[PDB]
Symmetry: C2
Subunit: 133 residues, 2 copies
Amino acid sequence: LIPKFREFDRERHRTDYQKGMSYAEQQDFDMGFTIWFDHIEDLDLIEKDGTINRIVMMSTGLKDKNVKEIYESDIVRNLYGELYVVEWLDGSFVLTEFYNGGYDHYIIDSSTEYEVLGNIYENPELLEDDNHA
Amino acid sequence: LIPKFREFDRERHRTDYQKGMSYAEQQDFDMGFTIWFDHIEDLDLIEKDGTINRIVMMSTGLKDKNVKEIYESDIVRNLYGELYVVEWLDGSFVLTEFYNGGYDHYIIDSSTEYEVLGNIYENPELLEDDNHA
């Protein structure tokens, strides 16, 4: 049942009282499990066939230096001051340079040597070369 | 919502008409998704608190040479005849040697250069040094 999930909903994020990012609760039952988020608000994501193309991110299973679980699409800083985006890529989580490299490095459970600073959905200012906004 | 899941249930496997391995169906709804397997049969896995310690494996998102999705705990053979078990380890899928190495190699989406031969639950004979059983 394993990885933890979170969902970002851009309409929830616009709305003041609602939280754009929802951390799931998992519920086990006799024929599987359910990953529960806040109610969807970006309704254009709901297809005719019932499939919903919600923006979902999985946990790496790794903790940062502040014992925060590191997730897919987190922005993290290493001990040397370098920033990366956590990405799922061909069977592994990798750290993607964005300053102007596009190089990927397999995430190194040296994980406690990283700090989560935010994420690409909530904190896009962090992706700006001259720092934030 | 992303990775695909399968579950192995050792009691189902014992039972003739039932399949030990169940490949999930995912169902999206407005407050999340449900991963549906065959009904559980190893009832000792169900805790008082409602949590169920079912043996669940995630897809790597990678195809083998026969365009089979490669999953966690598959046994795979490479082009050189070497066998590995697919394992989830510290943020990545890795190939674990079992002949008497215990070395791990990050899975290489050279994935089409691997063949799934079976898995550790259904096909433990494959893990025997002198071949099968």
